[PDB]
Design a protein around this ligand. Structure first.
Ligand SMILES: CCCCCCCCCCCCCCCCCCCCCC(=O)O[C@@H](CO)COC(=O)CCCCCCCCCCCCC
Lengths: 108, 108
């Protein structure tokens, strides 16, 4: 009977553009060519379903002492890309989890 | 001014063994040998450093109504695996974040 403190939505997605590990925005190839056959590029993306499952932020948080919200953390997936017209293999930034972050309130 | 609810540790790693997408334990290659160019397989994994970063469980949790602990979640990354003579690409699992899990009482 377990709950996560923030709700997530995971799916397989394709991207046309992404941002690599170092920051460059880069075109992500529709297809890739390995072992004389073509494959599409898919990515397992996990986003936040919303930033406040509970009206007071993350779930099960002590609201009296903590303000909170849920936001995503990234992973880095190797993919075939292109910056300008130079094609290269790079690690690109895919959202991989939905995590709660807290701000010690003495104000909000 | 902000804090994580559970802490995490990330690094780029090599894998000799790995759990596949269908549940099987499989062995990852040393190198991917493309066009007579060869590349090791690097994976970005994030783990928790602590199932409970605070005595109460996860940080900021209303411990009075909720029990809590932080655990890894998995992403799915294509790696080149082998069993003996037969190499194949398969989605293996990689720990990508530390999330807080809660159980006790309220719901909503
Ligand atoms: C069913 C079988 C079908 C297979 C087709 C796949 C379809 C799925 C979609 C996904 C597509 C991906 C396919 C992958 C195919 C592999 C091709 C091999 C080519 C190798 C080239 C390569 O490996 O890519 C490398 C560039 O050659 C990049 O490797 C890096 O140089 C090494 C790691 C360095 C990390 C540096 C960061 C340090 C910062 C500290 C950490 C803080 C972080 C914030």
């Amino acid at each position: 009977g377990e709950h996560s403190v923030c709700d997530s939505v995971s799916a397989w997605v394709t991207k046309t553009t992404a941002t690599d590990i170092k920051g460059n925005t880069v075109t992500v190839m529709e297809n890739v060519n390995l072992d004389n056959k073509v494959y599409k590029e898919y990515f397992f993306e996990t986003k936040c379903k919303n930033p406040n499952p509970e009206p007071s932020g993350c779930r099960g948080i002590d609201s009296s002492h903590w303000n909170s919200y849920c936001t995503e953390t990234d992973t880095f997936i190797k993919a075939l890309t292109m910056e300008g017209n130079q094609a290269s293999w790079r690690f690109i930034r895919i959202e991989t989890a939905c995590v709660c972050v807290i701000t010690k309130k003495k104000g909000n």
